[PDB]
Design a protein around this nucleic acid. Structure first.
Ligand SMILES: [Zn+2]
Ligand SMILES: [Zn+2]
Ligand SMILES: [Zn+2]
Ligand SMILES: [Zn+2]
Lengths: 81, 81
DNA sequence: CAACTAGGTCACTAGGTCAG
DNA sequence: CTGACCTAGTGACCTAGTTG
């Protein structure tokens, strides 16, 4: 049913204010718990991301996350209303 | 003067819990803190932390301080009208 | 009795692991 | 570095019990 609004994979829950997979989620937290910048992207930084190529572009995977809406200020603990 | 506010995180108030207008969240969070030996792991950003809807869950320490600081207490319960 | 609230549950999910 | 799996919490919903 519901699939990750980042790489299209099956969503594991409502994470960071967005319906995402365990992969993007984990990667996402990992990304902000360290403002550390991933290397730049070789191909005009518009690397379309999918279940298959997500791990290819870190700097775009990350932006995508930001782009879709994933934040610390968007966490919805609890039960689905 | 409707839609009273949880006097801790400003979130909406579901009622008058433990002596003060609170939200299910902070409400549950309180009876949970006292009804246990629960001793939260020390604060990180200079015991002060702002508590609001978005961040309330980040520093457990301050949150509890905040509750106690607004009046929440087991002895001030009002089952009235 | 009717407008309320403690308490209890249990559906959800950050965060932390650690084996590929 | 990534992502499957757990666990300690979080808070939306209910209901037993308490007042006016
Ligand atoms: Zn994903
Ligand atoms: Zn890119
Ligand atoms: Zn609150
Ligand atoms: Zn704090």
């Amino acid at each position: 049913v519901l699939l990750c609004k980042v790489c299209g994979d099956v969503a594991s829950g409502f994470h960071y204010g967005v319906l995402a997979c365990e992969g993007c989620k984990g990667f996402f937290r990992r990304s902000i718990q360290q403002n550390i910048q991933y290397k730049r992207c070789l191909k005009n930084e518009n690397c379309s991301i999918v279940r298959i190529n997500r791990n290819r572009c870190q700097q775009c995977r990350f932006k995508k996350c930001l782009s879709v809406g994933m934040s610390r200020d968007a966490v919805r603990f609890g039960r689905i209303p």
